[PDB]
Design a protein around this ligand. Structure first.
Ligand code: NI
Ligand code: NI
Ligand code: NI
Ligand code: NI
Ligand code: NI
Ligand code: NI
Lengths: 101, 100, 551, 551, 551, 100
């Protein structure tokens, strides 16, 4: 007996189903580490991260909500992106879009 | 003495630990509050003695064992935290999984 | 991508199909539904979802909620579901999916710059409890009740005076006015009961017009057929509730005589089992009638090994304290024949144990009787809904305040209690009153973080001065409200009016509408329903007890 | 029928002729009269008298009392009688026979639906005490005093500041205003004293107009003939009282010079014995004059074995602390030469021991001197009336507030203290302020009854927010009241005005009007009245001490 | 006549040339000036100076001060001088020579009948501290801070909610209004910060118009260039301050990108060293800019042996917690590169240790680096002025409230702290709020004097109800004040408006205006100023620690 | 520990009993508060041990005798009541005429 214990049924959960995704190779050219959150507009991340920003437009990381991906200096890796939904209107970040798309 | 609110608050912790201490002495399996109080008071005295944070983080995991507490208690206490005045001022001691 | 169910539960709390043990009892709940879109859950923190342009939008305050409880596991009379809870203007705005519609799908609870966040992942959220049997013997009872998870207190009294020690009555306009004024100082919603024992209607009307939301008929002031009839007549015309503690002495008549005096009119019977007062030894038969809303006081819940011993010296006594009716009471609760639980604070009842004892009874009944006929699935969901209703929605309906409080439904006051599963029903993680945290466990004030020892309940901002007034309600009768009592007494808290006290009947009690054909043997005191004997065994050890308390 | 006297005392408390020991002292009181009709006593409870149609009538609120204290044994300056006490609108309504005129005879205190009940059978009820020597060093003093049975506090101060540590003065309009505002937060009646040490009348008039009900002349600010004369002149024109702590140093003159400066005008002399301050070593001779209202502070009451030792280090000191005058003081109180007792809170006095010490002196005097010349019967009734007057009616008369408080008489504020005989003068059972219980012993808040341990004093509803404001009084000078000070400062409590401070004289002090021909030997400090030496022996052990306190 | 210097110091406190050790540290202050006239010092007591016609004059209240602190040793940013302090209408009236002009010379602070006295001879008096990094996690923090000597608290929060646990933000009009109302209940001056993380200006303007005096930009809500720019634009138009906790993850850019977004606009950077949050690992370079007002949170002050160990588990963490920057921070404070100290209450900071830790850093720096280049004489006067400015005047200037509080200058609110030299910075003797003592050490309430044990901090009259409202300030933005927010919410306390938040720059920080050419090695994290390495050694034992605390 | 108001209130009772306990140990005749505190604390520990209400009602009358308390004390205490968490929840123990 363990107070308040869970009895989680085995298996897995499929995240962000039915949505457009794309893979992008990203390389950190900066001298300091960079960490990106699940819902950040990928196309507007720290400028030291080199990748096809045009392909990442309107996309965010296809990772469980709340988690992040870290890039140590010089690190290169391929990440999977999933498209924003809702009104698909981007406001904030580096102020590059500030409107729909 | 000019006791501040925090000093008086700690008197409450100390007294709760006195209760637990006598019960452990009788041979009882401690419950949740008694366990937290006992280990917490141990750390405060450790700091008064001048032990380091690193040493207490380790020693604190050896105050009570799974056989000295009620069922489910170890899982109810993932960690115990307490601050006390060390020779170099107030420091926070975090004891992870204190009961095993 | 994909994520395993265990890692998911650890991050966002359990989802559809997962089961959770309630504290250290044998009761297990299963998530029936989840209102999220997997991958779009909102989480707060560094690098998390609720941030500008992401999970947080650009809307003005008017278009977003003031507070969002994220990933909450709701346990209420209507369901056990996983969802985000939105709170706006101190009331429940929506139960759904929180976030920013600019980038997220299915958002029903918009989060903006004006939104505060309470992380409820891994926590169980319930409505605040409602205790309708309060003896205002001392003001300290309010904090004790609030800490236990009770946010509304209905009762009567003037302090530690003989009349109040024995009855839930605030006698007359002067004391009523004084107590309505004192109520602004307490962090719980409050409604007062006046002394209903009189055979002159005007003496009752004055009290209702002064502010009481009900009238208590207690045997110590004379629970005679004449007095009972008089109180019900006034209740019928002023839309207030009547609470009854009948004639234990059978002085003016037997139980059937009292029932005859009531004449089919709506009435709330206090401690219907009898130990706390009532026609010896068959007041319990009242639960068979359609106009009777029956409740139990808590010392007899549940039947344990030490029960009879303590009760006898706590209290002719042998005719009031009966093992037979005490054992039957637990079962009647399990069947839905008794619809409410309450304390009877410091007058044969424990103010901080209404919730705790309700769950102990549920545990003991599951252990002894197994699954209810209504249960579906391999969980205790229905029994949990039946029991939580006893101290939330049913007391609210009985006293005409269900339009304001009593459950987690849109438009109702945001009185919510957040619980860690291991401490469910015992020690809350956060108690919210009207949209603000009013009391919560708090560690060292000088610590670098809020968690270091000693951790004990301390009043928060929702319990302070003017913020408190804005987050609590003082219930008045329709007549008092119209007479301008609030303005005359210069009451500072929000005011609410009671209504619909005359039209509620046993059939309206959520999940507890059974009207059993119950009988009590005058000689043996044995309780039978349809001729079958109703009884149970006393517990030697109970959950939610020695594992949690220092004393 | 018939009932034995012992069973009767056990059921309704003692009656005519029975004697009761006061706590653990040697003082015994005898019931002088009983206002009941044997067989018609009102008792509350299951199957008892106060029930609909029986001891409770059908009258509307306006025709019945809000509260009735049943079967109380009243101990007041006017008598020691058994009776029911009626309270209406926060004031004493009647002392007589309670019940329902419909079925009972000789009812003078009608009990109706609007009536609350406090069972006082077996209890002693007294008026609330009045301490007129308060140093407002800290607000915590109010609770300490209230718990001891003191309901009115008169004094001065601004908090723990040097001026206040030494004197009972609230200096100037700003501090006066601030303290009048702070007073609304305290559960006792309050009146403030300003700094009377000035030789410019206008500086005093401003303070009176700001709200003070008196002016304190203290040697630390210069108790010179010029200052004394100035304060008395203003007091004479504004109807306020002057309190004096004379020139101990004999700097501006001797005691006869100060007396000459006073010039026959009314004045309250603080700690007239001298240890607490005053012309060394003969300030005590002031009690011989008709215009002097003399009081004692409590550390010297009564003379015990440890007295001199503690006083010396507590405090040239050898000229202020004199065994001769300290021993004489107890006797002078017994003879009625000294008319009041007070504390001198945290400035050579104990705020929670004014009442306790007054009774210890009475005990020690009975033990040493026997019965007073005024005693009649085999009881200590007269000595009890003489002493209770020292901390109730006499302080009220001295400060012009006897029209509101000070005794149990009709029309006065219902400030009452209920005592169990075994704890009389030590630990009250209930302290009522303006008709509501303000503080009382209270057990476990979560208990099934209010009696389980731990039992300790806790604030009740009469001490909460707006209810408190309605049950306490802030005393103002006639000028302040007229100037609209209450409206300007937005004071929330009830306001009362002082009057008749200039016309009271030694002859008006109830049971304590003796003007002895007293002398003090300049060399030996010996006190003589009519040439005879006045002295007493120091106690080694006192009642109301180690048997009751934890520390 | 003549008097020896030692006897003089014992009677009136030290004078010109005498040195005093601050608590148990190695810091010594030397009296720079004395404003008295030898032989004319005012002293209160029996036979002393402040008496009618002597040190006390005949003037009316309007022509004299309400309170005088006699013979105080003032320690402020402008000097360390011996003088009398006059307080009138709750504000600092004058720093000079108190007394009566009728008989004394050079009197600048007239003492009259309306004057209260606080004896400060032998005591050090300072302005009340100002903590601008408060997380309103619980109301108990106010008492803890007040007891430590902090009288103004600026921060944000709604109670123990996830958003507040992490950020100093009171989100939106509803919570802002509720918290402004709750503020009337707390004994400290209060100003609130709203959530500044939004890219829509109107959502920010609403919050400012609701009452916040600043906007907190925190990485947990998204510290992006877009959000930063938006908050600064609104701050520039509404004259409010912006506090920043930058992007530690370097997600939206590096430190240079954030600095670029700021674009030379005024901003207060929280915990500029980085451990408490900010661009890893070079947020510390911000102290080189003219528009940045940099502060430190207290857990890293000063660098000790247990620091790294506790911080690591308190908190990728290895990039935030750096020994290199933690050691450099102490030195940067000593050089005046960092201008403020604050707590970061219960979110990586200790609310009752802002003052204590500031002095421990000063001690450790003196011990390691010796005298500052600015020091003159054989004392630590300049280092003391540089450090006291970090928690008094500089925080006041940074947040636009220096016109009301922050130092002991005429016209400012009388928020003063009296310290006995042996307990300086650790345990105050008296804390005065707006002219009234609000909290102080107090012994046995029932004692004959205020000094017997147990002595512990207890609320005084300045912390009670209406007196409290009159002695505290609620700061509002100019827009809120104009919109009538105080009248709408019915705020009872005095109101003050912030102004001049946009025009303050690093050059305005008193004694802490250094703009070093500082660099941080991306790999090693080493801090260099002008190429030279900045570092220090960790303390094994600190003053103001185990000698004073029970736990 | 998450101590509720009632748990903290009982800490006061426990501490009062510590005072009495040391005094009885010195050989003093206990006064009124000391006697109530000592017997009350005895019962609370009894419940922690798992003793029944019936057993404690009896055992409680044998903690102190008339010769261990001051004169008049036994008559000032007609009964002593205290509640504690028994294995089966909170129960009230009433000890009638505890001192003889
Ligand atoms: Ni009842
Ligand atoms: Ni009841
Ligand atoms: Ni005096
Ligand atoms: Ni005095
Ligand atoms: Ni931060
Ligand atoms: Ni912070």
């Amino acid at each position: 007996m363990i107070p308040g214990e869970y009895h989680v049924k085995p298996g897995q959960i499929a995240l962000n189903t039915g949505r457009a995704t794309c893979r992008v190779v990203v390389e950190n050219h900066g001298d300091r580490p960079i960490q990106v959150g699940s819902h950040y507009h990928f196309a507007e991340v720290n400028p030291a991260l080199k990748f096809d920003r045009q392909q990442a437009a309107g996309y965010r990381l296809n990772i469980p909500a709340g988690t992040a991906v870290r890039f140590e200096p010089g690190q290169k890796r391929e990440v999977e992106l999933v498209a924003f939904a809702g009104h698909r209107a981007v406001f904030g970040f580096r102020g590059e879009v500030m409107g729909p798309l | 003495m000019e006791l501040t609110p925090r000093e008086k608050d700690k008197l409450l912790l100390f007294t709760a630990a006195l209760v637990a201490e006598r019960r452990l002495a009788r041979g009882l399996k401690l419950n949740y509050p008694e366990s937290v109080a006992l280990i917490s008071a141990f750390i405060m005295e450790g700091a008064r003695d001048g032990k380091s944070v690193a040493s207490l983080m380790e020693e604190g995991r050896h105050v009570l064992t799974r056989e000295q507490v009620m069922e489910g208690v170890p899982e109810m206490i993932p960690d115990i935290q307490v601050e006390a005045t060390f020779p170099d001022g107030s420091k926070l001691v975090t004891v992870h999984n204190p009961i095993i | 991508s994909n994520i395993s169910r265990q890692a998911y539960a650890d991050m966002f709390g359990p989802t559809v199909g997962d089961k959770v043990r309630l504290a250290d009892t044998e009761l297990w709940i299963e998530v029936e539904d989840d209102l999220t879109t997997y991958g779009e859950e909102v989480k707060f923190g560094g690098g998390k979802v609720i941030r500008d342009g992401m999970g947080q939008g650009q809307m003005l305050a008017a278009d977003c909620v003031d507070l969002v409880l994220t990933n909450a596991l709701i346990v209420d009379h209507w369901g056990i579901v996983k969802a985000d809870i939105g709170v706006k203007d101190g009331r429940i705005f929506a139960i759904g999916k929180a976030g920013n519609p600019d980038i997220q799908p299915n958002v029903t609870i918009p989060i903006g710059a004006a939104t505060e966040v309470i992380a409820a992942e891994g926590k169980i959220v319930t409505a605040g409890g409602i205790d309708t049997h309060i003896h205002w013997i001392c003001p300290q009872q309010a904090e004790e009740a609030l800490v236990s998870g009770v946010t509304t207190m209905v009762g009567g009294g003037t302090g530690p005076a003989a009349g109040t020690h024995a009855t839930t009555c605030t006698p007359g306009p002067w004391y009523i006015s004084r107590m309505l004024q004192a109520a602004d100082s307490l962090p719980v919603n409050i409604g007062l009961l006046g002394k209903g024992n009189v055979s002159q209607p005007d003496a009752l009307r004055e009290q209702v017009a002064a502010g009481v939301i009900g009238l208590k008929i207690h045997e110590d002031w004379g629970a005679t057929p004449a007095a009972i009839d008089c109180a019900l007549t006034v209740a019928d015309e002023m839309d207030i509730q009547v609470a009854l503690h009948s004639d234990t002495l059978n002085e003016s008549g037997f139980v059937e005589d009292t029932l005859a005096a009531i004449g089919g009119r709506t009435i709330h019977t206090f401690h219907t089992e009898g130990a706390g007062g009532g026609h010896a030894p068959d007041i319990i038969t009242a639960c068979a009638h359609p106009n009777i809303l029956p409740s139990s006081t808590n010392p007899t819940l549940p039947y344990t090994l030490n029960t009879i011993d303590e009760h006898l010296d706590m209290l002719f006594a042998e005719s009031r304290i009966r093992r037979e009716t005490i054992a039957a009471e637990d079962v009647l609760h399990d069947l839905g024949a008794f619809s409410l639980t309450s304390s009877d604070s410091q007058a044969m009842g424990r103010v901080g144990e209404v919730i705790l004892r309700t769950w102990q009874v549920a545990h003991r009944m599951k252990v002894q009787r197994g699954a209810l006929a209504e249960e579906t699935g391999d969980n205790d969901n229905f029994r949990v809904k039946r029991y939580i209703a006893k101290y939330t929605i049913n007391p609210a309906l009985t006293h005409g305040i269900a339009h304001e409080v009593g459950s987690i439904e849109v438009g109702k006051l945001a009185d919510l209690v957040v619980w860690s599963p291991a401490f469910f029903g015992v020690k809350p993680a956060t108690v919210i009153k009207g949209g603000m945290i009013a009391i919560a466990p708090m560690g060292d004030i000088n610590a670098s973080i809020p968690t270091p020892q000693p951790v004990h309940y301390r009043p928060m901002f929702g319990a302070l001065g003017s913020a408190r007034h804005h987050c609590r309600l003082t219930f008045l009768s329709q007549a008092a409200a119209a007479n301008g009592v609030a303005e005359r007494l210069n009451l500072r808290s929000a005011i609410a009016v009671v209504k619909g006290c005359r039209t509620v009947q046993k059939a309206d009690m959520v999940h507890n509408s059974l009207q059993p054909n119950i009988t009590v043997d005058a000689q043996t005191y044995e309780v039978r329903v349809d001729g079958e004997l109703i009884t149970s065994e006393p517990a030697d050890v109970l959950p939610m007890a020695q594992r949690y308390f220092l004393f």
